[PDB]
């Protein structure tokens, strides 16, 4: 955080997708690649590519409940995790103006897996928390697929040196949902590892 001038940013991308049948029990598989990541879980492959963002994900968590798959792509401690999410100031300017979080859903419902067992609902309304509104329009681009009834997505890109440097980079937020008349909420429960 010692203006090289390098900037250090973090990123969280949340994807929630409700499918058209109750979920089948699957084995989770995730892959992090250069400026993106993907996860195959619950009958859906969710892929996130970061276009002109100059940022890498470090972790993918998942959740599955009823008919809904959740994924959280995130960065971790930025000074101890490889690859380091640092960038020049000119690259941060381009991130600010041009970063797109390109989300792609692919249905992969597998009839060789039985339906998830369901006792009592493992999620409850007070597991979802409101998030602030978008401050960057059209940062999220989403492609859905036929088996998906609704998708919700949220991105937060933030300064890791904000508390610290003497100045801070504005947090960039966007939110997109196919749902109508629903509050701006995301699952805040701790996700499972993939």
Numbering used by the authors: 6 to 199
What did the study's authors say about this model?
To understand the structural basis of the action of A41, its crystal structure was determined using protein expressed in E. coli and refolded from inclusion bodies. Phase determination was accomplished by MAD analysis of Seleno-methione (SeMet)-labelled crystals. Electron density was observed for residues 26–219 (numbering for mature protein begins at one) and the structure was refined to 1.9 Å (final R = 20.4 and Rfree = 25.2). A41 is a single domain protein with the distinctive β sandwich fold seen in the vCCI class of poxvirus chemokine binding proteins. Sheet I is largely buried from solvent by two long enveloping loops on one side and sheet II on the other (the other face of sheet II is exposed to solvent). One of these loops (the 9–11 loop, residues 113–144) wraps around the molecule and connects β strands 9 and 11, whilst the second comprises the C terminus and packs tightly against the face of sheet I, and bears strands 14 and 15. Eight cysteine residues in A41 form four disulphide bridges (C6-C166, C33-C199, C58-C104, and C112-C152). Despite sharing only 19% sequence identity with CPXV and ECTV vCCI, the structure of A41 is strikingly similar to the poxvirus vCCI family of secreted chemokine binding proteins. The absence of the 2–4 loop in A41 may explain the specificity of A41 for certain CC chemokines and underlies the weakness of the interaction.
The A41 protein from VACV strain WR is a secreted 30 kDa glycoprotein and very similar proteins are expressed by camelpox virus, CPXV and all 16 strains of VACV tested. Collectively these data show that A41 binds a subset of CC chemokines (CCL21, CCL25, CCL26 and CCL28) via a site that overlaps their GAG-binding site, but A41 does not inhibit leukocyte chemotaxis.
